[PDB]
Amino acid sequence: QGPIWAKIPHTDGHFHPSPLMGGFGLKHPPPQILIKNTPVPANPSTTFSAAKFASFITQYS
Amino acid sequence: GADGVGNSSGNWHCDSTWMGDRVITTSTRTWALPTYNNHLYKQISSQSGASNDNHYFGYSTPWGYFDFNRFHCHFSPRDWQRLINNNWGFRPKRLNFKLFNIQVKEVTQNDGTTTIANNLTSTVQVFTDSEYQLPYVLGSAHQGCLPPFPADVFMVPQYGYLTLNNGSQAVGRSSFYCLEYFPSQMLRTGNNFTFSYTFEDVPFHSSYAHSQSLDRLMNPLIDQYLYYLSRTNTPSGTTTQSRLQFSQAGASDIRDQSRNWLPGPCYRQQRVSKTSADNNNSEYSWTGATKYHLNGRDSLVNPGPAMASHKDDEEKFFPQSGVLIFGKQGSEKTNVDIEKVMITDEEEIRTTNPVATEQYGSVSTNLQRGNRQAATADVNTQGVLPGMVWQDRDVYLQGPIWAKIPHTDGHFHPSPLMGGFGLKHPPPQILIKNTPVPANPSTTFSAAKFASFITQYSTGQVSVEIEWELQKENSKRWNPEIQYTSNYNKSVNVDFTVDTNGVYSEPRPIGTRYLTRNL
Numbered sequence: 290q291g292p293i294w295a296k297i298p299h300t301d302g303h304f305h306p307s308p309l310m311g312g313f314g315l316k317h318p319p320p321q322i323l324i325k326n327t328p329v330p331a332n333p334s335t336t337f338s339a340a341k342f343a344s345f346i347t348q349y350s
Numbered sequence: 351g352a353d354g355v356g357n358s359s360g361n362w363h364c365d366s367t368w369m370g371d372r373v374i375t376t377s378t379r380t381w382a383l384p385t386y387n388n389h390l391y392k393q394i395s396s397q398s399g400a401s402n403d404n405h406y407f408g409y410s411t412p413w414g415y416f417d418f419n420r421f422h423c424h425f426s427p428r429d430w431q432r433l434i435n436n437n438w439g440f441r442p443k444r445l446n447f448k449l450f451n452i453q454v455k456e457v458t459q460n461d462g463t464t465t466i467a468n469n470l471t472s473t474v475q476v477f478t479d480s481e482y483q484l485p486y487v488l489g490s491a492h493q494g495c496l497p498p499f500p501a502d503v504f505m506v507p508q509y510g511y512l513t514l515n516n517g518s519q520a521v522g523r524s525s526f527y528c529l530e531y532f533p534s535q536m537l538r539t540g541n542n543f544t545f546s547y548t549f550e551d552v553p554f555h556s557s558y559a560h561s562q563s564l565d566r567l568m569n570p571l572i573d574q575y576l577y578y579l580s581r582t583n584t585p586s587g588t589t590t591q592s593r594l595q596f597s598q599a600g601a602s603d604i605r606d607q608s609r610n611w612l613p614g615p616c617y618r619q620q621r622v623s624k625t626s627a628d629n630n631n632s633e634y635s636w637t638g639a640t641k642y643h644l645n646g647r648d649s650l651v652n653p654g655p656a657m658a659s660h661k662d663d664e665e666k667f668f669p670q671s672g673v674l675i676f677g678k679q680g681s682e683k684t685n686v687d688i689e690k691v692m693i694t695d696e697e698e699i700r701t702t703n704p705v706a707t708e709q710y711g712s713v714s715t716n717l718q719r720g721n722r723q724a725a726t727a728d729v730n731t732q733g734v735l736p737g738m739v740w741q742d743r744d745v746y747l748q749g750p751i752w753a754k755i756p757h758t759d760g761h762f763h764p765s766p767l768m769g770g771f772g773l774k775h776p777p778p779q780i781l782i783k784n785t786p787v788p789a790n791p792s793t794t795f796s797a798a799k800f801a802s803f804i805t806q807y808s809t810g811q812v813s814v815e816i817e818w819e820l821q822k823e824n825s826k827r828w829n830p831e832i833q834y835t836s837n838y839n840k841s842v843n844v845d846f847t848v849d850t851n852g853v854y855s856e857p858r859p860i861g862t863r864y865l866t867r868n869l
Contacts, residue, residue: 349791 294318326350354540355470360450363813364500366429372443373433373818375424379496382809383474383506387412389786389803391528394510395518403647407515413529414506416780417488418814419750422498422856427846430747434864435833439554439821442751445777446815448544449476452537454784456806473785474808476543477534480778484527485511488779489753491768496814498748499854509781529781536785547778552771554821555745558867559698561827564611564739567869570601576608613710614703614740615732617655619669621707624688628666639670653767656743657706658699668693669706674768676748679855694859699741701869734762744861745769752776784808823865832864 295308296318306314329346352359364378389412396405418424425433433440454472458465487509494507513524537543580597583590599606620638622629641648652671660667676692704710709728718724742765745751753766754776764772787804836845843849845857 351537351541354538357540358451359540359542360448360811360813362811363815366426368432371820373440373820374815375429375818376813376815377424377496377500378811378813379500380503380809380811381416381506382503382807383414383782383784384807385412385784385786385805386410386414386508395515398518400518403649405515405518405647406512407518407520407524408510408512409526410508410510411529413509413781413783415487415509415782416506416812417492417494418496419488419491419752420495420748421745421751422748423496424751424814424816425747427747427860430860431834433820434557434860434862435831436823437820438558438823438865438867439556441552441554441819442549442771442816443819444546444548444817446544446546447780448542448813449537450542450811450813452541452808452810453539454806454808456804459805469787469804469806470539472787472806472808473536473538474782475534475536475785476780476782477532478545478778478780479532480545482775482778484529484779485513486754486776486779487511488776489750489766491750496812497854498856499848502854506782529783534781534783550773550775552773554819555771555862556741557862558823558865559863560701560869561866562869563701564609564613564869566604567609567611568607570604573598573600574607578606578608580606610737612735612738614657614738615655615734616657616704616706616710616730617651617732618709618730619654619657619672619706621667622670623666624668624693625666626688653743654706655767656696656699656741657703659696659706661705661708662700665695667707668695672706674743674746674749674859676859679853692859694744694746694861696744696861698744698861698863703740743767743769744863746862747860748856823867825865825867827866831866834860834864 291311294313294315295310297303297306297308297314297316306316308314326348329348330342331344331346333342362378363376365376367374387410391412392410393408394410395407421430452474454469454474455466456469456472458467492507494504497504509529511527513526514521515524535541535543575598577596577598579594581595582592584593584595586593597606599608617640619640620634639650640654641650643649650671653674654669654672657669657672659669659673673696674694676694677686678690678692681690709730710732711729712726713729715725715727716722746769749769752771752773753768755761755764755766755772755774764774766772784806787806788800789802789804791800846855848854
């Protein structure tokens with residue numbers, strides 16, 4: 290149940306990269322995957338505003 | 351899968367055809383699949399207090415499965431009569447299976463009345479193991495078959511399994527299987543599923559009955575040339591003296607004749623009668639049972655080895671566990687009366703197998719001498735001796751088609767006891783599940799496991815097709831055969847049809863052996 294890998298910091302020198310918790314030090318580890326719910330506005334006013342929207346449809350995926 | 355949401359994923363073939371050699375069968379039903387356990391596995395064990403032989407240990411999965419093990423799924427009562435009356439044997443060559451027209455509903459319990467609406471994006475996931483890596487539940491004759499009558503709708507049963515136990519506690523060798531760890535196919539509304547299967551070679555089932563008993567193999571007209579010892583002592587005077595005489599056995603004896611063969615083996619049963627006044631008053635049900643003892647616990651032998659049942663000119667008697675018993679329409683689970691059950695009758699094996707309630711024979715106990723008289727004892731049990739013959743049990747109609755031979759270093763004569771076809775690689779289990787849908791997670795991260803899910807169920811249609819091979823009869827018998835016939839007299843209700851309330855029922859068990867062969 291411990292960690293598989295870690296990323297070596299980008300530095301002028303490092304001695305023996307293997308990380309301390311355990312596993313495999315990598316200079317270019319598996320990249321991070323990032324995910325988001327696209328915002329949906331809710332029922333704008335009839336007259337133009339120019340203020341930023343404070344109201345959104347509540348949803349999840 | 352294919353295009354969907356407004357295009358059907360399959361039609362209804364569902365027909366029976368007869369090519370003169372092989373039979374092809376198809377049937378289609380409509381099913382409904384609930385979510386079981388609330389999307390989670392659970393271990394299950396017997397109760398704290400219990401008999402030593404009632405303990406068990408196992409697991410219960412969210413998954414559920416399709417099973418057609420029974421003939422009435424694949425045969426109407428009429429199609430069952432080309433087979434029986436017209437054929438000596440049949441075997442299951444090949445089968446085909448598919449699911450189509452999947453649709454998933456979600457239900458809302460708001461207020462005091464539920465509403466049900468489509469969820470078009472929800473999925474259902476299905477797989478077949480086919481490598482025989484799971485515990486194999488089929489062949490244990492559970493409920494949940496496809497209905498015999500094509501217009502009924504059925505509910506898909508839940509899947510579970512048992513492993514080694516000690517008391518109610520597990521042992522170290524017991525195994526735990528997670529069905530989520532197999533590859534499966536996730537089916538959305540427009541998607542469909544198929545696979546096909548091929549049976550291994552298996553001997554035909556025998557739908558003939560013998561026209562000769564193993565007693566009488568010979569013509570009475572001619573005497574044998576062999577001798578037997580007819581008479582032990584002779585009346586030399588008012589007192590007899592010992593003199594050995596020998597004789598040749600003709601038609602006037604026939605019990606003394608020499609033979610090349612013996613009846614099949616037996617493991618004996620208790621006898622009971624259908625007339626209530628005849629039987630004894632006590633509980634012998636468990637104490638008088640025939641049992642086998644495995645690992646310190648006793649288990650009833652329900653079917654037992656195949657044996658003739660009621661002997662001759664006694665219909666009234668049947669072996670205690672020795673026969674299969676079917677319930678009529680709408681019978682309760684427990685302590686039901688005699689007229690509610692349908693008790694099968696096997697008299698056709700008299701000619702070979704011994705009666706279930708009587709001994710195999712007698713055997714000599716001691717060595718005679720001048721002053722010590724001979725003695726003998728009845729043998730209640732026989733293994734297999736070289737040169738014996740026997741028959742197997744009828745498959746009937748609503749009984750099971752096949753079973754799986756256990757994987758073991760040895761087995762003698764695989765054919766299973768309930769009936770049908772033993773297979774080393776039987777049709778694989780098909781397992782189906784509703785994919786879980788989370789409901790409204792909290793705004794801040796948690797890391798606890800989800801306890802809340804959308805309540806939903808799915809439904810659709812299922813189709814099965816099997817190819818059967820037939821063995822025709824060629825016989826020179828002059829006089830006509832016994833056939834299966836429906837009574838021509840008038841009645842309130844026709845047999846094997848719906849009643850006035852729309853309830854389909856099966857009046858009686860129907861066995862497969864009518865046509866006659868000579869032994």
